[PDB]
Write a protein that binds this ligand. Structure first.
Ligand SMILES: NC(=O)N1CCN(C(=O)c2ccco2)CC1
Length: 119
């Protein structure tokens, strides 16, 4: 029933994601010299350094907000990919599966703790 536990749990999950080779394309923003049309396709860029920095600045109120930004990293990859078999998109799918598998208990525990708090 710890309402604040999600933050350290998210920090540790972000640490695991940064150790994963599949996250390399998603750690920093996309360079426009390499992908000139990126902002024509993607209106809201997002990356794992921005998520980690937002978390560490105390700018997420809940793990649901963090989850929305992480999911935006993956939807941006799906929207930008020219093919469903591309290397970078295929890395996003594995990383998304890993993230969803680990974030599930973080979300469940937070929502349960909040319900207990408001009982
Ligand atoms: N850091 C980068 O330069 N990226 C390249 C564009 N991105 C993609 O999701 C993507 C899908 C298919 C090909 O690239 C984000 C990562």
């Amino acid at each position: 029933y710890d309402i604040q536990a999600w933050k350290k749990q998210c920090e540790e999950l972000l640490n695991l994601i940064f150790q994963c080779e599949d996250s390399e394309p998603f750690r920093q923003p996309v360079d426009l010299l390499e992908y000139p049309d990126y902002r024509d396709i993607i209106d809201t860029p997002m990356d794992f350094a921005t998520v980690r920095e937002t978390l560490e600045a105390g700018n997420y109120e809940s793990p649901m907000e963090l989850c929305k930004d992480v999911r935006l990293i993956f939807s941006n990859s799906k929207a930008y990919t020219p093919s469903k078999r591309s290397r970078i998109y295929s890395m996003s799918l594995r990383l998304s599966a890993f993230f969803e598998e680990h974030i599930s208990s973080v979300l469940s525990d937070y929502k349960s703790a909040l319900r207990f708090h408001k009982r």
